[PDB]
Amino acid sequence: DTDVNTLTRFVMEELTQLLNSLCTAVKAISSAVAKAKKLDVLSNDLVMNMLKSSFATCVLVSEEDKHAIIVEPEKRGKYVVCFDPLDGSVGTIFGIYRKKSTDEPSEKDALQPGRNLVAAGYALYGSATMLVLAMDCGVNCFMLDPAIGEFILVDKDVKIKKKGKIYSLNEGYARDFDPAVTEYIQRKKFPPDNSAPYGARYVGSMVADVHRTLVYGGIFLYPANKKSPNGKLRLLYECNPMAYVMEKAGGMATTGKEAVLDVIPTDIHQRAPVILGSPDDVLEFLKVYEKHS
Amino acid sequence: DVNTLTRFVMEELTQLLNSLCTAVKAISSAVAKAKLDVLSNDLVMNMLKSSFATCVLVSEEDKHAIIVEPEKRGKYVVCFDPLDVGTIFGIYRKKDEPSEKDALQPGRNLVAAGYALYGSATMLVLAMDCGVNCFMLDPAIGEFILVDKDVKIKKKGKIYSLNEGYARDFDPAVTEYIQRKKFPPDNSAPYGARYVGSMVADVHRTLVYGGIFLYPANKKSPNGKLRLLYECNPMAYVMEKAGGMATTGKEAVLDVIPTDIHQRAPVILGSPDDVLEFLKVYEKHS
Amino acid sequence: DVNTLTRFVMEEELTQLLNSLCTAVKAISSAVAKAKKLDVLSNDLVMNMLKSSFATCVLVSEEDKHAIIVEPEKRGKYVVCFDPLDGSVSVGTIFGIYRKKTDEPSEKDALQPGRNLVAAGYALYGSATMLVLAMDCGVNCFMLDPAIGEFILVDKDVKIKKKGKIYSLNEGYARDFDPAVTEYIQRKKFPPDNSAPYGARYVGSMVADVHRTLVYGGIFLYPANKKSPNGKLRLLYECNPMAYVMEKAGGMATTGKEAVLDVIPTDIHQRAPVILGSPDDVLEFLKVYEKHS
Amino acid sequence: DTDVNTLTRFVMEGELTQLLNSLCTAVKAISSAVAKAKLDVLSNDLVMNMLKSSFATCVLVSEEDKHAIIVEPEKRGKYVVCFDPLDGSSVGTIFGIYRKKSTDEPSEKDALQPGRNLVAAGYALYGSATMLVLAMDCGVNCFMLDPAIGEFILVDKDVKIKKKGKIYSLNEGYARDFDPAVTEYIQRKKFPPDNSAPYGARYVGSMVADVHRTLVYGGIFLYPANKKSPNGKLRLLYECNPMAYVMEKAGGMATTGKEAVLDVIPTDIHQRAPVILGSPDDVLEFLKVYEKH
């Protein structure tokens, strides 16, 4: 009340400037969402302009642009940012790297594995706007307080449930499942040990589904198959930030054959399968997966 | 200049809906800055009573019907779910001393029904005899504003919506229908699946995008799980007034005659082609 | 349980009229916050809202040369005189409501003395939007709660202080004041009874100055001057509503010769001098006025 | 809308940015609390806590606290802030920012600089819209709080005051105590020697509102010395100096009657100073009369 605990204060304990400009873009997107393809492009412009104006970034990768944006040298800082400004048509997803090579900034500075992330998270636009921010120390949830236009810390050092009771994927594409996913889903509905079957939830928007997985536990799947052999979600600005949040909350995220965060990308827009969530549920999937390998 | 819900309704019932809108705005605010369903129940009850338009009030939260004190008594009976997130409501004219039996009317008797959905924006869908209209809460001025007139649902959709987690307990007809959605026999494209787990959100998506929503009966749950009076009937009335369908499997939800205010009903609703297709599967398999 | 203006009115057609007026005030409040053109915007809002209420037949506004006659299908039994954006920081809305007292509605129905008022009040657009409503039984204050978009009862049966310590007028017109005003003002600064001089306040917007007078006591004057020899403020939709609020709060409102509320108007835009506020202060002014006539 | 021009981005063109960012947070929180209404002690605590957390300040002087606050060494930065957290309790917040001049341990004496040494100064005015006026070496800029996104947005660049206004502003209730020069100056406003139009009078009674009107419409604002108060009534460090700085950067004047407010060398953090400020032609006419006495 008299000691507002804002995201700025929490992070202050260049990166502060970066995240402040991002919060400004998230608040503006939140407002534009509340008063509603056009919104996609305007969200992108907002995030690009705010991140450039922070003096903290040198390379920006967006879902909207084929090539990385290289920041003008007068506005250039040391961070690389990959973002999805309006995921789900909703939310915003971001991942922040430190530039590693010492040469002139280029698309290659964004090709780091998620293990190299300095900070990642997402904003979920709903009745309230929530911002989940993962850093090395752990995961913290902030809520936009619309009265004062600040993100307030509301949940510190978030940890995901060890085991969940919800599974989340688009089962309408069952005809195309690889056998491992088919059997894993069968075990959730027909538990061979006579325990209670899992409930199914699928919002259809990654940020909402992932957020519910974090808060309530369970598993979220956007898996590969013979039709989409690398999955559908984008590694740099969807899978890697979500995998980083999950891992820092004590969860897991795998493509099925390796940790999402260990994939070394060659293309800023490459896709990745992803299965993430409560560690016991992801382990159970990886166990069914290996059986089919 | 400003096309509010009250103006639409005027062109007593207006006083009832005005009081309901006040409760809905208060709940919308409480949801945003979050026992919450107990607060929400009190809100809707207190405003409905203060409207001088109601006599019998049925809520998900109260075991018995609330009878309105005679000073504040009006003509209408209201069944509502204050925090289903969303708010659901159904409004009947009474027809004798007001009592719990006045709420035991088939949904066919509804005068008005609809729901509020609390998201990034707060939407209110209102169905009356002449159709369905959609209102958005403009928080700048605190009024529900007309944004979609005479809403009709698509004839056929591309989404099916149910908790597939319960598949082991499914009725074989539901099992068969869902199988045809994923593995279409006539070589058409499979349906997508969506299931939020919140009935207002799932029904609203069905109204807007088209498709089918199911919370059907099985042998563990022969009457389904949703409540007829303050969940199924209002949603069914909205669906029918938008050119869609709502069936229990055996009959139209709106034609069920309740005997208890908390009784459950199976519900299958949405686009008419899709509900008809389910009914076809339902005929041949139990 | 929420104590709204519409609930208060119902427990005491007038309710639809006041409901429609509240919607216009809420909309004006928002346009003021996010701001000539606003004058006619606000007039349109009030005109359209009152017409759609089905409760009015004759509408008089500052912005319209002649009285508006409501189309027969939307007609009701009430006459409304209003200033939609008085003072156009500090602005407000002023309204007075009469019952039509014959034949076909026309301008003459608006020409009743303020004594005949059924309801009157004002909205003050500040950091909070306040609505003060006067009816037969007294004055009540409502605050707009923006979280829920309703006017909430905040002060019941408001009574003005018997004697205040603030006087309020534009002393820039000192050269044009008649001798009673000059002597009265001089008594406020140099009290012949060794009491403490009054403070002076003058915002220059009638609603703000009158609301301060109501809440803190004192006296407000807008006498005639050389360029405004019949007074400056408009009798029908400025002085009469404020005079009715004052009298219903136990205060007074005079032209000098007689009660504002007893003036019988001849023209819908005619002006009046006005002295209003705490009864001891207005009585002291009247004693000076009588001495000079 | 996609290139939001925030106070932050204007100031970035970074300890001063951090300081001003943290001040903006307190101003937004105060703005909301005023709208939803011990407010001055709450406001004071909010400003102190935000300024402390900024890591940019070392000495804080508040209108509310007898003694200066010395910032703990771990949160210490180079700036000295004098502020009036809720002036008028129409209300506003006033601030003046200095750079510490000294290698000595931070103390009350670091706040005893002439206003000529200010790095930044200004005020927030809470109303229907919340405005922030910021004066820096290069001039005066006005920002409007956009409540949709919780950011101060640049709405008017390089503000200049009118050369001559038509409004004078002071509390004429104190007339019995006026120094003869103020008496004569005010008389000339009402009875102009040259047969020009008399000035209008406005006096809200809140310094931020009265000064802001003076800035926007021109004219003159006076809280002068007299025999009872030889040093005026308003406070030099956190009222007179910030307003004098704003005025001079806008092309106006601000005098005690004997010298520029900004050139007074303070000896006490709470000392008073007379202040006469506003349009240059009007202040010069005041100084003509004051010299005469």
Curated annotation (Swiss-Prot), chain B:
- Which residues are modified to N6-succinyllysine? K101
Query: Which reaction is recorded as catalysed by this protein?
Result: beta-D-fructose 1,6-bisphosphate + H2O = beta-D-fructose 6-phosphate + phosphate
Which superkingdom is the protein from?
A: Eukaryota
Which E.C. number(s) belong to this protein? 3.1.3.11
Mutating D84A: effect?
Answer: Reduced activity
> What clinical condition does the entry mention?
Fructose-1,6-bisphosphatase deficiency: An autosomal recessive metabolic disorder characterized by impaired gluconeogenesis, and episodes of hypoglycemia and metabolic acidosis that can be lethal in newborn infants or young children.
Name of this chain's protein: Fructose-1,6-bisphosphatase 1
Q: Which organism is it from?
A: Homo sapiens (Human)
